[model samples]
Target: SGAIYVGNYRVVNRHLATHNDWANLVWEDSSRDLLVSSTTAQGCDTIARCDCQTGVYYCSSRRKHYPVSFSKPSLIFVEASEYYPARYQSHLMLAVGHSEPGDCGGILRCQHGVVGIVSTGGNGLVGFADVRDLLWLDE
Candidate 1:
């Protein structure tokens, strides 16, 4: 998606580059950390880089009244299809795990910090895109 300018912030989406599930809120007038604050008492202090190839790491995302669901990564693969092989899943990161519907685009936070964003899910499996590379592109 393209960037939309608001009064004091710019709302940008990564739909074109990543897909329909990533966005960044840019606050031009703010001097503080916009993503540092926690929704709960015990919240994350920073955003971390995730290594999906490693051991199991638990993550969470909240939806509808801030209800959170916890899950672990079951698979990390490029989401490919028959017709579109190369162009497809080139920059997309997909994960499979337990997550609720309407959880897409929600922040996926682990114990350390934010790792990914909820993309899609079905049949006891959820997909997410890695936040590290997304942030890198923005930076």
Candidate 2:
């Protein structure tokens, strides 16, 4: 046998610099806070209260006639929208997931940012697996 003993050894990932693409998600479940009162163009935007115990998101507005999860944007005035279904899927949305504050925070006008290789379904939605395993670069 070799005269060598390995003990107290630890494996760790490489230290990567934080990029702008990675945004911190603040949801009702994680934040443990209820929906904050806000004014929308319509008038009232009541999104119900948050259940800190169960950590389950339930929007009173969504409980009505809305699609539970995904919803389309509302068109106030328009003769015809060529990109209705092409863009908007269903109807107006309210608190889809306890109001995701980090939804596309760094996607709109960002130049270089981290993008997930995983696609949600077909829309090519990218989401991060883990913050530690993220690696993004400009090319």
Candidate 3:
């Protein structure tokens, strides 16, 4: 069975924002990965997979998953909302219509490179965290 435990990854460090947004650098097995989000929750670690043929992204929350359709990258302004505690900084916004809850922190990849990290959204937009700053932490 595919069971993910909390100790699956070791928390190396983190970047916390005043508005409840934060990013954690965790070590799993031997590789390193970043966990970012606009909201916080317990025992909600999800993995995302993309279907190249369908261009659809799927999040593995349980044995079942949810499908997400994302539009081309665009620059849009997302105002603060009840779901999102603070105003989002200027960054690429993807129009991935309202996806199921717990989809935040999904990595946005393009051409084999990570461009953004899922943050927050409502109505029909998804915010992203700048990966450039996050890459600095890797150094």
Candidate 4:
């Protein structure tokens, strides 16, 4: 209903954290017809509609929805509990499983949070930070 404030997002290995391939997302202006796509997972490859006038990405599918912000994000790291043996760098890890969200792996999942960046029309600011959901961000 009103302005919400969340500081720069940062996550440490205080809790168990795993090294995974982070999928990138597409970003566009917040003042024109926006069309951002994702290729993170199966079925997450759908074209999501946006608030063209506001340059905000919006979707009806609960399983494929994300927070309003989607631009550059700051990531922090710490010693993870799971030990990835130095000898295993030669072998690539593959998990043949399943996942979600308009095709991207990282989506800002918060009940209410906004990038709060002033939109300039074309190529507006976009990014995602689930600081409020950090407990599960690395899950």
Best by TM-score: 3
Error of 4 at 42 (Å): 12
User: Model 3 RMSD to the real structure?
Assistant: 9.7
For candidate 1, lDDT tens digit of each residue in 1-139?
1222212332222332232212333221121111211111232234555543322223344322222343343333433334322122222334445544345445555554555555445455545444444343233
| Candidate 1 lDDT trough over 10 residues, lowest sum | 29-38
Error of 2 at 73 (Å): 2.2
Please list the residue runs of candidate 3 whose C-alpha ends up more than 4 Å from where it truly belongs after superposition: 1-76, 132-139
Local accuracy by lDDT, each model? 0.36, 0.18, 0.37, 0.23
Model 3: pairs clashing at backbone N, Cα or C within 3 Å: none
For candidate 4, give the lDDT of residue 7: 26
Off by over 4 Å in 2: 1-68, 76-92, 105-139
lDDT of 1: 0.36
Q: Find the candidate with the highest lDDT and give its number.
A: 3
Model 2 C-alpha lDDT per residue in residues 48-128, reported as the tens digit of each score? 122111112222322321112221222222122232222221112222232211221111111122111110112322111
C-alpha-based local distance difference test score of model 2: 0.18
- Sorting all predicted structures by lDDT, with the top scorer first, yields 3, 1, 4, 2
lDDT of 4 by residue, 9-38 (tens): 222111111233112223322222122223
Better of 1 and 4 by lDDT: 1
**lDDT, candidate 3, 1-48, per-residue tens:** 112212233121122222322343232211112333332334333322
